[PDB]
Structure formats: C-alpha cells, structure tokens
Amino acid sequence: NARAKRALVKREAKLVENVKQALFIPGQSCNKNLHDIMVDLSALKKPDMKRFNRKNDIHPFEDMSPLEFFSEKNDCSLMVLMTSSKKRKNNMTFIRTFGYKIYDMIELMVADNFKLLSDFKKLTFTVGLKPMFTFQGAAFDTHPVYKQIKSLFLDFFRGESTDLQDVAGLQHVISMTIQGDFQDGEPLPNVLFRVYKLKSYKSDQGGKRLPRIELVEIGPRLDFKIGRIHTPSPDMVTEAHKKPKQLEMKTKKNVELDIMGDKLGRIH
Amino acid sequence: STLIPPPSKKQKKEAQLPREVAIIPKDLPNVSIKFQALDTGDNVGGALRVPGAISEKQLEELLNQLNGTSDDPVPYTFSCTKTIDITDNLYSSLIKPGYNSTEDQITLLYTPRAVFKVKPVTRSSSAIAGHGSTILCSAFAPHTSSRMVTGAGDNTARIWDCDTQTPMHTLKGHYNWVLCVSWSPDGEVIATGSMDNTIRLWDPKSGQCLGDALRGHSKWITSLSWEPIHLVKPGSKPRLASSSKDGTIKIWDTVSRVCQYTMSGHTNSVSCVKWGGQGLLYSGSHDRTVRVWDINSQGRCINILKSHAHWVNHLSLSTDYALRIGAFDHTGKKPSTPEEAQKKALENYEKICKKNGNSEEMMVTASDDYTMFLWNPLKSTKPIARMTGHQKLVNHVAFSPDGRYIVSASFDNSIKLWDGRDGKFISTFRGHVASVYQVAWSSDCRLLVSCSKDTTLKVWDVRTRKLSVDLPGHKDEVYTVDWSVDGKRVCSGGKDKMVRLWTH
Amino acid sequence: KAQNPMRDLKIEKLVLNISVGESGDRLTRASKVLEQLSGQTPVQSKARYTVRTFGIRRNEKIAVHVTVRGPKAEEILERGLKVKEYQLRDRNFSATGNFGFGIDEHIDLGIKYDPSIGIFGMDFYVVMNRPGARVTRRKRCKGTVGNSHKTTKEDTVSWFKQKYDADVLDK
Amino acid sequence: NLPVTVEKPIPVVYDLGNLAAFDSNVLDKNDLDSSNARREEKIKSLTRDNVQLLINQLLSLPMKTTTESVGGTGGQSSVMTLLQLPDPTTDLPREKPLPKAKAMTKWEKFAAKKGIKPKERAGKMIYDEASGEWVPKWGYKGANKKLDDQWLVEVDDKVKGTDNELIDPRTLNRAERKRLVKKNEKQQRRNMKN
Amino acid sequence: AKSSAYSSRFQTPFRRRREGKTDYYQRKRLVTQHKAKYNTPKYRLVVRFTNKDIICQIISSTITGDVVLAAAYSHELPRYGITHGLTNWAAAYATGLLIARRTLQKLGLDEYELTEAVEDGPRPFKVFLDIGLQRTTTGARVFGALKGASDGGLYVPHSENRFPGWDFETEEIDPELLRSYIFGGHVSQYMEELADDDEERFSELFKGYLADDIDADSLEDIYTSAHEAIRADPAFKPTEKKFTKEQYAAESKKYRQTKLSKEERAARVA
Amino acid sequence: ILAVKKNPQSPMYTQLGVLTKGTIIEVNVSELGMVTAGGKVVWGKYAQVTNEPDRDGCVNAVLLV
RNA sequence: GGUUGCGGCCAUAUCUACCAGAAAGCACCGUUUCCCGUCCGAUCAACUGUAGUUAAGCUGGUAAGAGCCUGACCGAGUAGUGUAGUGGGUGACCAUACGCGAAACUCAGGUGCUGCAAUCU
RNA sequence: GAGAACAGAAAUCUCCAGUAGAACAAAAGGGUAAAAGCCCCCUUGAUUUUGAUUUUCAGUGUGAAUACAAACCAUGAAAGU
C-alpha cells in the first residue's frame, strides 16, 4: 500500500518535472525494418524508454482514446507508433501528450536508404548520457512544421537536465538537417537524422584549452518524409508552457542580494 | 548547512548570453624577451624576439638550446615581473590582460623544477589498527614507500607494510611512550627514542632489537638525528644524535654501541637537534638559544645564536630532505657499492647546497614568540631575516625539498609560506579551524600536507597558493603526518589509535 | 553408458517425520527422541489451514522432522531394514525413484525405552539420485536432469536388490 | 594542426542548457539530394563545424571545482572539474499542468476568521505524571489508548438509569473514539467535495 | 501434457535469465542508475569464479553491447611465479592486484581527451564491484579480489565488514589475520596440520607441493615475489598460439555436424 | 547566542526569547573547531542554560553533546 | 569453427523423444582445519584439481511433432467509413469523384543472428 | 500426479510437472517471479534542522506554520534505494 502511494506520488504533477518517458507501440502492420529502427531509437532514448510487443489496431488520425489510455496507464508522455501501409511505408508516428491528452502528433515515414545501428560496426557511446544537438536549416527556427519537429526531438532525446556537466560524458551529437532550402507552395523537404560520435585531438593552434573536434558516424541514419501534422490549440499551448514561478525569488525594485548574502536596498 | 547566495535574474540572463572564446590571434607580432635566472640573475641571449603565441614547452626547448643542453633538457618554469607564472602561452599569460604592451620587452625569469610529478592524495587507502594507545610519531622508509614506522604510547613501535596496509612487525623493547622514531638514511636501522630516556635500535627486516638500549640520558628523548651519508666514509655506518629534556645532545656510535660525545651547553630542555651537511650540529632549546656545534672539534660549541624572546620549538635546514634521504631517490634504487652510494649522496646534497656561486646551508628557527628567524650561520652570526605575522606560537617549520620555500605551521589555525632565501612573506594557507600541529612536503615541492587538532588533514597546492583537497576521516586529534619519498602515500596518526594511509 | 561409474544410485537423504497433531509435552518428547536418534536438532512444522475435526488451529505446531545425509542415513536405514526384516512392498516405491515406510514403535531399533518419554513412531523416507543431481539446487544456471539419467522405480528396485539382497513383495 | 575557428555568414545561436546549436544558413539541395555521392560528407562536415562551435562555447563556460574527497555525498570530487550550464533557452511544453492550489477548507477559513495561529508541532511525546515516563500521545503504544488496558475503571453514576450500564467502559470509549475518527473522515470528504 | 494454449501463452524470460547467469534487477541499478546527474560514465569490475579459474574484467556498458577495457585471468599466475592454488583467496588477491596494475599501466596513471582541456591532472580510476549471482559472505574470495584491486590502485568503493577477521560483535577488523589470508596462512596451516595428523590426506591433497618440492614455509615468500613481479611488469603477453585460426576452424568443422539439404530431407522422408 | 530554541516554561516564553534556567539555546561554536564526519565545519549547536541570569547577571550554559 | 566471461535483440531462442561431442574450457566430482551458514558442508563458505567421468550439465543435429517467426506486384487499394456538385427518387435506399483504410485465406520460406576480451588439437 | 503407521475427500514429510491459474494494490486494451509474494537481519530516527527563497497569521513578524531545496539520517560489499 505504501509502495502504491509512492507510485501515485511519482505519477502526480510537480513543479520541476521528471524525465519524459517514451512508449514504443507496434501497430497492426509491422515489419522487421520497423523493429530494427525502433530498437535503435529506443537505445538512443534509454533508460527512459518502454516498448510493447503485441500488435495493436491503432489509427492516430481517426481516434485518440487508446493512445490516451496507454499514456495514462504507463505514465509515458511520449509515444512512437510503428505501422506500415502502401500509402505509408515504414510510418512512425511521434505523439506528445499533455496531461494524458493528445498535445500534438507528427507522422513521418522513413525512406529506404536507411542504415541501422548494427551496419556501421563501430564503438558507440555509454548508456544513458545526454547528447548534443545540431539543427541545420532556417525552417527549424521559422517554419511551424520544422519548429514542431525541433521541439519534439529536443523533448524526446533531451533526457535529464542539469546545471553541472561532466566533460567526459560529451560523446555523441544528434544532427537534424533539412534536405535543401525551400520556398512557399512546394513539397516539404525531408529531414535527415544522423548520429555522430566525437573525437578530440590536440590542435597546436588553439592551445591546450581548445582541441580540434572530429566526428565518426554511429547510426542510425534516417530520412524522414513529413507525412501528417496535428497541431495543438493555442490555449493548450499556453497551459503547457505555463511556468510555476513559485520556486524563484520574486523581483523587487531597489532590493538586491550582494555576494556576502546581505539584503540591500537602494534609495534615490 | 549554510549556502552561498543564488544568482539573480540578471546574472542568469548574462549567463545565457553567448560566451566569448579566448583565441590566439594569428597576426600577433613578435615580442622582445630577456631570459634571467631566479637564483643567479644571469641574462642569457639578451633581448631576443619570440612569437607572441609561444608555448611553455617550446620556450623551454629554446632555453635548453641557448644554454647548450638540447640533448639533455631539464623542465623549467617561467615568471614575470608582481610575479606572474607563465601557464599556457605568453599571450594568454601576459599580453591577453594587457599589462605589458608587445613593443615593451619582458624579463622572463626561469626556475628549474623537478622532472617527476607527484599526484595529490585524495582518499584514505586504509585505516589500520594494532596500536593500543595514542600514536605519537611516524616516518617512512627512505628507500621505499612500502615500509612505515610508527611509535605510540603503548610503549611500542610498529613497522607497517603499506602494500597490503597490514602490520608487519611489533617492536616491544621500551618501558614507556615511544616519543620519536627515525629511519637510517641508508635505510638499514630504526632508532626509537622513548619517554624512559632510552634509545633502542631495530633491524626492520627481522623486526628485532640490536643488542641493548643506549643509556645516559636523565630525561626523555625529544629528537633524533642521523649523520649524513655523504659525510659518512664508506664501509662505516652513520652515528646517531639524540636530544632530551635534560638539555644535552648525546652522540652514539652504533657500530660499537657507545657514546662518544655529550654536548652540554644548554640550560633548559632541548627542543630539537639537526645534523647538517658541513659537519655541524644545530641544537634548539627552551633557553631561547640555538647552539652551533662542530663535530670535527671534539664536540665543542662554536656559536650561540640569541635572537628569540621565548622557547625555540623547531628548526629546519635547507638540505634536510637530502640529508634524510641519503643516497636514495624518488625511484628508490639501491646502489651497488657503498662508494657509489656515498658519491651519489654527495651529489644529491651538493645540488641543493652549492649553487649561485658558493655553497650555503640556511637554517630557520620557529619559536614561542610567534616568529621565525632565518640564519646563515656559516657566514654570519646575526640573523639574516625575521619573519613575523603569526598570532600564536609557531609549532612547526619546514624547508622545501629544493630549499626555495619555508612553510610555518602555527597554533593560530594557519600556515604561512615564505621565501627560502631571504625570508619574505608570500602567502597564508587558511582552512584549518584548530591549531596546526605539523606539516610535510612532497618530493617535487608542489604539494603540502598538514595535520591539525581539528581531526583533519589538508593538501595544499603551492603554485596556486590555495587549498587542494581536505581529507577527513580521523575520529580524534591527529599528531603526526608524513609523505613518502616517491610521493605515492601519505601516512597520518593521532588519538584515534589508527594509522591512516592515504593515496591518489 | 550404464557401465559408467557415475550412473550408480546413492542415498540423497533420509527424512524422518513424526506428525502428532497436538502440540505440547508429547511433541517435546518426540523432539527428544528424534534428536537422540539422529544426533541433530529436529525441526517443527507449522499449520497450513484450520480444521475443527483435527483440533488444529492456524499457525501451530503439528509435526517434527529430521533430515540425515550420508553414512548416518545408511546406518538408520539399515537399522530400520533389520527391524522390518528386509521386506518392502511394490507399492512403497514411488514413481520418481524414492521410497518410504512407517515404523510404529521406535523401541525395536535398539534405543532404550524410558518411563517419561513414551512410545513414538516415525515415517522413514529415502530419496535416491544419480551423481549430478545438484544442478537443480545450485544458484547459478539451475538446469533440468537428463531424460536417460533420471532415477526410475525399476532402477531403485534393482539397486535395492543388488545392495541389500532383499526381495520386493508384489502384494 | 587543422584550425578550430569556424567561419559562418550567419552566426550560430546556442542553447547551452540543452547542449544545442542552431545554424540557419543557406542549404543547397544539389549537395544534399539522394542523387549525390557527396551528401554524407557534406552533412558530416556541416555537423562537424556546428559541433566545433558548440564545444568552443562549452569550454568557454565557467567551471565549478571542489575540495571534498571521494566517498561522501555530492558526486563531485576534488580532482573533477564540472561545467556550469546556463538555464535552457528553448521553451518546450510540459507533460502535465501545474499543480493548482488546494482551496481553503472550512477549518482554515474558521481559523482565519477567529485568529487561530497554527500549532508548533514540537513533537509527539508527552509526560505521564502518574508514572515517570515520556510516552507517545497517539499511535502505536499511544497514551490515548491506556484506558483500554487500565486494570480498574469506576463506573460513572450518569450511566445509571440507562441500558448502557452493563457495557464495558473501555468498549464505550473505543466506540466513542472510532465515532470521532469516522466523523473526521466524513468532514474531510465534505471538504473534498467542496 | 502441455496444451497449445500453454505454448501460445508462454512468455519466455531473457536468454541470459533462461540460462540463469545474469541478474537483471541488479544490472539495471548497476548500469542505468546514477547518484548524480552529471553524465559521468561508470565502469564495472566483474569478478567471477569457475571451478578452476578466477576471472576479473573491467567493462563499460555501451548501447551496442558492453565492452571490455582490461581483463585478467588466473592462468597468468604461473608467469608471475604461482604454480599451485589458482582458485584460492590468495590467488583472487593476486588477480585483483594484477588487473589493477595492468589497468593503471594501460591508462598511464602510474609511470587528447576532452577532460585534459579542463583539468590539470588525471582522476583516479573509479570502478564498481560486480559480483553477479554470488553470495555476499564474510570472508569470500570475491572480496579478496576486491582487496587486491584496491591495493593495486583502482578506487573501488567498499566497506570492510566482509574481509576475513571482521568480528561480528565489535565492528572492527583483524588485520593480522587479513594479511595471513592474503599470503595463504590458512592453506599453510591446514597443510601443516594435515602432515601432523593424517599422512594419507597430506599425501593426496597438496600432492603438487611435494611433486614440485615446495615447503609450507615458502608460501608467503612466493606470494610476495608474485606481487612484486606483478607490480614490476603488469603488461599482458598473449599466449603463443601454436596453430592458426583457419586450421582451428577447419579441424573444428571436421568434427562439427554438417547440415543436410532440404531435398535430401525430402529424400530421407520419402 | 544564535537563537532561543525551547523555554521549558511555555512556547510563549520561547517566542519572547526568555532566558531562564533550563532554556535550550543555539550557540556559535566556531572557535571550538568542530568538524563533522563529512568534513563540514560545525558553527552552530545547542546548549542548556544551567543558572538563573536574573539572580547572577550572566548566562551559564552547558553544551549538549 | 568449438568453448569461457560480460551483453544487445528477448521463442527463428520455447516444450517433448532420440544420437554426436578430437582437444581446451565449462560442469559433475574429493576433503571439512580455517572465513562462513543451515535440522542436515544438499544449497551456501573455504581447500586441493589431487581419485575419476564426458553418464548428466552445456552445444549441435534429427521430427509430413506442438509452438513461433518473416516476405508478398495475395486479398487490395477490397470490405468497411466521411464529404459532395440539386444525382434521380412525395418513399425504406443506390452507382458516382476525393480522402482514410484492415484482417481471415493463398504462395514462397526458417527454427538464432550477433558486439567486446581471452583460449583452443 | 506418485508415495510415506495412526491420517479416509482436507492434519505432517519427499520427488516431478507447474506463466503465476497463489497473494499485493488497482480495475490494462501488456502492474509484480532470483518480486512489488513468503521468511530473516538492521534501523524506532521520521513531527530532524538550516535557508537572504514561495504562501499565510501583526501589536510578540529574525516567530510559527506552509512550499521547495540542501545538510543529514537508514540500509547495503557496492551500484544505489
């Protein structure tokens, strides 16, 4: 009973949130290619990851209730549905939920020119360290769709936040790049998802404090074509982006805290 | 727990502002420098122009070339005159703050340093039991870091194996507290001076007592000293000097197990006796005086130094590390012959004594008048310098192994760092909250360890003059601390009856 | 295969069980007779349900048992066989190569009767196994026994006939 | 000795809290299309440039150093030097709404009206004067349940004239205690419904 | 008689749980759990005992499978001078010392990473002890290997209540008995008692000691020389492989059974 | 004196800061040089007042260790 | 290519009956002074690898076995479901263009791939 | 399912099979099996105490509650919880 209450308190809301957990759900149609790509993505997400095994007849753009059911049961705010069809081959649906209700959904398809984690056969990063991110393309900062993609992937692979970082834990970078620039009224370019491992060398030009960085590809290399979009409502956006303000000291005019910790007031 | 203040909203915003990268410009013009030695002040090469992005190792290679030792380089350090050390490159060290323009010449002072590097001790390797009373004294073997000797108040000494952190031998000859222990500078015999006015010698390999005790002191032994190896002629063993509360210094021949001289000038308790490298003995007593005796002249008092207004508590010689180490090194190699041992010990002693023209052996005396006096007794009988600044008695004083710094541990919970040549004040190490009992150097003179009444050890970095690592773990007051010759282990002991071994 | 010396049947254990029903001084006497019969301290039994007819409540003491392994088990087994004059039924042997029998009075085994102790019986049970039987009991890589290697009822009957040369009564 | 200084027409913006770098420069699809043989090298080179700039910023961050030894609470030892990451700049949706405040209960409003300050809660031990012991005032072995184990109770004269004369006073006290507890639970349920 | 419903509903464990040798409840806390959130990588000192070998490995978990950093086995003890008793407490201590010294030499701690750009001197190497499905008992050879690694120089966090000589009443250690156990004092005492009491048991057990003419008083000396040799030259020499890989493969496939084709299977059916 | 922790007469006298016999106070112990097992410096502990300052004009306390 | 330690995917890996396993490793196996734990040295703990064995353990192979898995240009862009041009029709209801879109059934198949280290007649 | 004297359909002991078909909270459309079930060891501190930080009560606001955090505390070989 006490363990049950502890689980309930873990499930309940808080001012400073936990790491978002991700649930990988196979659909009614599944393939080995989907299984291998899901395994790679779950290895990138882990250990904030859970995976289903049985098939579920789920259609995100027709109904949301089974997805909300799984989210509320598993305490998972991120969902990845793997499905297949003639119109949507290797279709991965990324779902973000807010308060066990659907916040937003993006639907991507993986192109055939993809390589798994086992293809490269190179040394990879240690389990459970937060990655670096790179986002190539002005549409990530301007366009609504690529803004949604950037926010989703930052939220998905960000992991636990910290104010202190051990430098030895900086190994791998996730790169999301736009396949060429575009203009209005055209097909939307695909997003390329690459994973690199860092190597450092003495530069002899930036001193001993600045090294030369080089990259070695780990995988998976994925090419996402943007199939379908489901944006959140503005009121839902404001509700999801409300900050607590209970934890920070309130700003007071002409009142400061000096280095010694004395509260001081300035007069004029 | 009391915490530092949190950053404000403005400070968080400025932290979020993008950072600037300290980069080296590529068109940075060449700058004129003049090399000069710290100890001798010799200008080598004149004013030569070097690239502004020059590194420490490339500058060191250039200096070795100009001095003509490119085949056999010795790593040095560079300072600028406010004395600022050159860390990474000349541009970042001096030009980047802009204190000196490029067109102006820079006088770079080069100081030789130690080739090997000693890692700071960071953790308690083990807490070893075995003593039944408070631990009073400790020393490492001069040749190896695997053998340690500790004397305690249960009338026993103990030889500890530092490799497994387990006891190896128990020495139970004495009848009272074993006040002092000392290892022979050739690493063959352990001398223990006790509260029962006796000195006992031990074979450490077998853990045995050599014959009977040396007798003749009417009061408890306060300090022990060994005759230097480089003065000892080959085929013979060093003599042992002992001091006691009765005010005498007795010299013992261990080969024949007799007493040769009993110097008797002092009127109160002799605090300490140190056997120097020019055939002299320096004795400090509670009669506010330091006596210089000559062993070559049948044990007569040559000099009386009178400048202290209270008890002298400790003294330290510049060559004390070399004299204690003998012919051994930070590699701990055992010489093939006593001849080669004597020659190597002589060279090791000379590398610190004879420099900057003539050989000198500075002495420093720490007293109960809250001060220290720096002397050069070979050349002058008046004090070279007076070091003041401590608020309580200076309990412990130590010269750095290369003889360039003096560290003074006081009862005002502070340590102070002074120049070892002229005795000017450099810095104050703070962080002990109780009286600092004694202190110890590393072999490469970059790290210092201090034990306190506050049941803690502390490791300090000399170059940055700041606390490196605080080591708790002792349950009670810590009385003795030592650092190994190779710099691999630190031993400590006190009222908790536990010998603590600390490593990196 | 059969001629390999690792297929010989040995004694796994001899378990002596005394089920008295009501806890008390008689149960203590049963513990004493088991302890002095074996040289080891016996272990009591806890109740599993409650029945009014048995007069057994919840979480009580009902029985004791002793497990004996080795030459002592051989000694007690052969004393029991001497009391039973070397005749066992076909039905006593269970299908997994294990067999037991009841002794009604402990006096016939040779232990001296005493006034305060009383009269007690016991259930002998003997477990047989071939070498390699510790696999299902070890902590790491607990694995199942071979199909040919498992002890059988015919095999324990044949080993009994070879060992004690005592006939096995069908009826 | 390849350089570490990367030139870009449009400066890269940084979110050092999330360890992210965003570059919005012109990307040509001729070199990133699937029909090109140099697409992987192009992507790797641009990622290398962006990661190099990000690493330069991270090594330009201020650093925290400590002096405590290993084996204690904290996870930072003296030999380790950590980077101080600023607060993340990018705003991301939360997974759940913020905890709304509990509405003021009937008791809390009554205390606000009548000037009742909340109690100190120094502890749960009380001194039982008839003995020489400090005992808990409630809970396991609490002093509120001593009447049930008291050896002798005098029957109150008010119980005469009623049908409750014959019942155990300890039983009556236990029933009264349970009635009070269940009433407290009912009041909590009512405050919950409001 | 397992029914088809049972065969359909059966939910198999992991492979390593099926062949029970791995504790996943323990491994999840060893790998994915962190004291702080600084993304500091962790390493495991896995210590394992067979019936004739003691194995120590230093492993870091990776997303494609965990990787060995440095390994040491007790069949290398004859190189350092131990020819008998390769699975005892003293052998475990020597193996822990060997793996520590080898690791320190490989990492260069005792005679360009991104950490060298921020810190002046290298950190001590911190590892966490992995014991697997072995009992934690006072005076176990796994804790002997732990003591050996700690003395060799790897920072392995531990308490000392499982070392031999730990008194259960007074929370303190018996360092003399600990040293004796390090140098095989219990083995030598058993040997001397055997020689005094049961001559046949003394002839059977410790037969190699007589065959190589090894006294009971030289165990401490040979363990000391082994530790000195280990500290002197801890680098790993591969065993000189007499044959080649393709020869090994060919002679192995000579005895390994060959598959039969599907048409041949239809032939044997028909 | 750092604070008044517990005046045994009444919590009202505690919040008024009354120093009578038996009052628990918080004292600054910085000059005693105490260190915790974790290396932290103790600078605040508790003491009990052992006299009557209204009668003798001074506060006497014994440290609670 | 066999094997051992540590893993990923967690049945193509599981369950049942058979035979093969040169060497090494693994295991069974011998002892109970010592550290240690039980009713019981069975499990656990310790010592020797000294007496033996590939019988079990473990690996492989065998079966119109059970179970399980993968491709389909196979159903099929089908059933099913939502718009609609005033599409007829006072009527239950039906072709039509745009979207979203299964499974049953059929063919082809199979009963482990692997990462790091060490060792191998 | 086989057996073991009183002891049979239910008292106690042994072997084999046993995806949980038992028992914990909950109402999964996938909760828990070297456990989240059963037994044992250690802890009785759990209403600790510090805070320039959030919220509230004045005539006693450097006080108390309250939120959050940290130092600790418990346990374990340890990772950790």
From Swiss-Prot, chain C:
Of the GO CC terms on this record, one is: cytosolic large ribosomal subunit
Query: Which SUPFAM superfamilies does the UniProt record give?
Result: RL5-like
Question: What GO MF annotations does this protein's record show?
Answer: RNA binding; rRNA binding; structural constituent of ribosome
Query: Where does it live in the cell?
Result: Cytoplasm; Nucleus
Location of N6,N6,N6-trimethyllysine modifications: 72
Q: Which UniProt keywords apply?
A: Acetylation, Cytoplasm, Methylation, Nucleus, Ribonucleoprotein, Ribosomal protein, RNA-binding, rRNA-binding
Q: Other comments?
A: Present with 39000 molecules/cell in log phase SD medium.
Q: What is its main location?
A: cytoplasm
What the protein does? Component of the ribosome, a large ribonucleoprotein complex responsible for the synthesis of proteins in the cell. The small ribosomal subunit (SSU) binds messenger RNAs (mRNAs) and translates the encoded message by selecting cognate aminoacyl-transfer RNA (tRNA) molecules. The large subunit (LSU) contains the ribosomal catalytic site termed the peptidyl transferase center (PTC), which catalyzes the formation of peptide bonds, thereby polymerizing the amino acids delivered by tRNAs into a polypeptide chain.
UniProt record similarity statement: Belongs to the universal ribosomal protein uL5 family.
Listed under GO biological process in this entry are: cytoplasmic translation; ribosomal large subunit assembly; translation
Superkingdom per UniProt: Eukaryota
UniProt organism field: Saccharomyces cerevisiae (strain ATCC 204508 / S288c)
> Is this entry keyworded RNA-binding?
yes
Query: What name has this protein been given in UniProt?
Result: Large ribosomal subunit protein uL5A
InterPro entries, A to Z = Ribosomal_uL5, Ribosomal_uL5_C, Ribosomal_uL5_CS, Ribosomal_uL5_dom_sf, Ribosomal_uL5_N
State the oligomer form and interacting partners. Answer: Component of the large ribosomal subunit (LSU). Mature yeast ribosomes consist of a small (40S) and a large (60S) subunit. The 40S small subunit contains 1 molecule of ribosomal RNA (18S rRNA) and 33 different proteins (encoded by 57 genes). The large 60S subunit contains 3 rRNA molecules (25S, 5.8S and 5S rRNA) and 46 different proteins (encoded by 81 genes). Component of a hexameric 5S RNP precursor complex, composed of 5S RNA, RRS1, RPF2, RPL5, RPL11A/RPL11B and SYO1; this complex acts as a precursor for ribosome assembly.
Curated annotation (Swiss-Prot), chain E:
Biological process (GO), any one: cytoplasmic translation
Q: GO terms for CC?
A: cytoplasm; cytosol; cytosolic large ribosomal subunit; nucleus
Superkingdom: Eukaryota
Q: Where in the cell is it found?
A: Cytoplasm; Nucleus
Q: Which GO terms describe its molecular function?
A: 5S rRNA binding; structural constituent of ribosome
Keyword Ribonucleoprotein tagged: yes
Q: Where is this cross-link: Glycyl lysine isopeptide (Lys-Gly) (interchain with G-Cter in ubiquitin)?
A: 147
Write out the similarity annotation.
Belongs to the universal ribosomal protein uL18 family.
Kindly provide the name given to this protein in its UniProt entry: Large ribosomal subunit protein uL18
Source organism of this protein record = Saccharomyces cerevisiae (strain ATCC 204508 / S288c) (Baker's yeast)
From Swiss-Prot, chain F:
Placed within the complete protein, the shown segment runs 197 to 261 of 261
Note the subunit structure: Component of the pre-66S ribosomal particle. Interacts with NOP7 and RRP1. Interacts with RSA4 (via WD repeats).
This chain's source organism reads Saccharomyces cerevisiae (strain ATCC 204508 / S288c)
Q: Which family does it belong to?
A: Belongs to the eukaryotic ribosomal protein eS8 family. Ribosome biogenesis protein NSA2 subfamily.
How is this protein named in the record? Ribosome biogenesis protein NSA2
Q: Where is it localised?
A: Nucleus, Nucleolus
What highest taxon heads this organism's lineage?
Answer: Eukaryota
Q: What does it do?
A: Involved in the biogenesis of the 60S ribosomal subunit. May play a part in the quality control of pre-60S particles. Under normal, rapid growth conditions, high levels of NSA2 would allow the progression of pre-60S particles through the ITS2 processing.
What remark does the entry add? Present with 8660 molecules/cell in log phase SD medium.
